[model samples]
Target: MVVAHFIVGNTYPYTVSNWEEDIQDAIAVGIDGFALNMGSDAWQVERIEDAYDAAASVSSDFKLFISFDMSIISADADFIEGVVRRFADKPNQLYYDGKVFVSTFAGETDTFGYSDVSTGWDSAVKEPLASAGYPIYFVPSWTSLGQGALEESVADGFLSWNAWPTTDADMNDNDDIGYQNLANSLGKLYVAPVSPWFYTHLSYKNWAYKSDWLIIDRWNEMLSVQPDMIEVLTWNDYGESHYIGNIQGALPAGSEGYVDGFDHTAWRYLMSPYISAYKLGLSEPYINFESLFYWYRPTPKSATATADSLSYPSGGDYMEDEIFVLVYLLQSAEVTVTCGSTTQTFSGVPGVNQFTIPMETNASPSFTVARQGGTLASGTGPEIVDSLSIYNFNAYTGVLYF
Candidate 1:
């Protein structure tokens, strides 16, 4: 159960301060590592390097994985080579089987065959990089290749997806199940790239309506399927606005609404709970609990809740402080809560109809609540509190903390 976090260079609003703080916040919330994208600019690379430096300063537990844009490789092989060479010695590079983990993102071409191009840069660039001793993780954008093609190529792994002209059945049958078959057939590792926002931003008509639930559903499915490693679609790509970074103008800025302030809090809340489950290895523990406790009441008065007390489970015990609470309601409900120093308004549900409030303490931690929505809910009865009453479910509560 590896909880891999992703960050992108071009997508972040790119202020050194915001970048540093966001990276630190991500790590503190139990992310095992990050997958960074080197899009089409040197400035992006510089900003990414800054993020890498910050991650390193905090702790060595966090690992860095980089993905290069295919166009960059196609336009200039020498240029791409120079960039790889420059970063090869960096401390954050990923290593597997004695080689660094390098990935690429480009449209499928003739060499790749979905859309053939005259130049053979697609096939040509990889050999030189391998010859130079870098291990490549070839992530084909499309899923037509199947196991046979992946096995025949020098790729370390294949990216799985079920896009247009391809169905979920095809992705599952060919690449996913086929990946397992190929791994057994050819003895290679298969890594799964799960894009949370792919459908929302890339699908027909840029259908923003389905963005939030689609990401959550896809993520849930990915976990149930259990791949070697998961690649989040992007950490930052503000142009698309589906990016999960602190990018301004990517998410709407205004009064309280369902999708308000989504970009600001969704990633922290969503990623933490799921990642914590992955780390603990009790994926379905919450199912056993009676009712899942949620602090729907948003008021400035502090509120605290707890799970029904039980003997600690044998697998491992999660401290009360480690539990993170997440809320997903209509953004029209203006809510404000303070847990530690991070205090912000829930003006709207970023694209993902959700907000997270972390609880940290050996004993139950209290959340100071305030409403940013149109009108506050009438809850004067000592501040409403909620708690889980099941064994595995209630055992671990609060925000995700590393």
Candidate 2:
């Protein structure tokens, strides 16, 4: 099953109808459900109810499951069981192999000061639910624990949150392959992670993982080694700048400067076909439609934010000053990309391919795909500036298709 991680805390003041719209939007793009990430906040619980109710009303097949934010929720069995019991029997609750599906952001290392590992999860959350006749299929993104989770915890599966490339390197499928092999050997499940991008500029947090062409590369990796399931890193996480959903509420304090105008909906366009192919057990994605997806940061790597007090992001130097264009076609076509005078033309085959042109000051990037002297799709994206008053590494994405 393909699901996107949904941040329940971000849906403040979101009515049932709002959630229905979100669910419908996700379904339109082939997402099966949402892994609702929630904290221990009082307000967030209300929104979680709204999400389940919305899913129940909108699509019976669209599932929803709770993913406790271990950073905020302590290892209390009562609290965990209470929350899981609240929605375990719901019509839209996700189920795998006849057991209710559950997940968590992080909990393997006892970051919240929990001394007992099993008491924190297995005894606290898993066993009690089973006794109550509500079996659960647990899959957590405890990437820090690595392979040790097999004996350390009672996780039914593992989901790696390392979906992005390091500062100076490209992302690889080694981690995904490792996890899949480990889980399969023990007859457990492995849910792979795929995200579009990651960038954040906050007072307490300021960093970025390399995301250029990550979404495309990760999808290709998943197609090769088909995991039991796939989880999109996030559907709406405006703070870290990997949001694929709409801007729902007020932006996190410092993120407004960069995340405001940077729309990420285009990344979803690149996911639909791949998701369908994976579900059908296909070896590669079938490009049934012609489309173009492009993205780039607004400012160059060396540009300094004069008015901003925060320093440059930790991974900022790893980023190259270039605009990237991705295209999907049913047959070979000639594609032209332009950024000021730096034009790049490449042959796009029957599947998918990518091209890049040096990002130029005061120039917007445009892309077009044509076959037999006829245009398939074309679009111009936001302009890239040489400098900015505030440093922003968030990429602005746009999509065009026929």
Best TM-score among the predictions, by candidate number: 2
Error of 2 at 198 (Å): 1.4
Model 2 lDDT tens row, 149-193: 644557888888878987578889998888899988988889899
lDDT of 1 at 263: 40
Residue 9, model 1, lDDT: 42
The list of candidate 1 runs beyond 4 A from truth reads 1-16, 71-75, 110-123, 133-149, 163-175, 195-205, 208-212, 248-261, 279-402
**Candidate 1, position 88, lDDT:** 65
Model 1 alpha-carbon miss at residue 6, Å: 5.3
- Residue 188 in candidate 2 has what lDDT? 88
Span of 10 residues, lowest total lDDT, candidate 1: 288-297
